[PDB]
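User: Please fill in residues for this 44-position structure.
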């Protein structure tokens, strides 16, 4: 528990919904907790 929420409390609800096709799409494999974070911020 707490896979996508990690990006919500960090970035924002409306900020994760835009990159939901990537974040949740990555975790499905075996990403880390220090990846999706630096990833989103890097994109935006």
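Assistant: Residues filled in for all 44 positions:
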């Amino acid at each position: 528990m707490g896979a996508i929420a990690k990006l919500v409390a960090k970035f924002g609800w409306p900020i994760v919904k835009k990159y939901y096709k990537q974040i949740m799409q990555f975790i499905g494999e075996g990403w880390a907790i220090n990846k999706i974070i630096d990833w989103i911020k890097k994109h935006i």
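For context: The chain has four helices and no strands.
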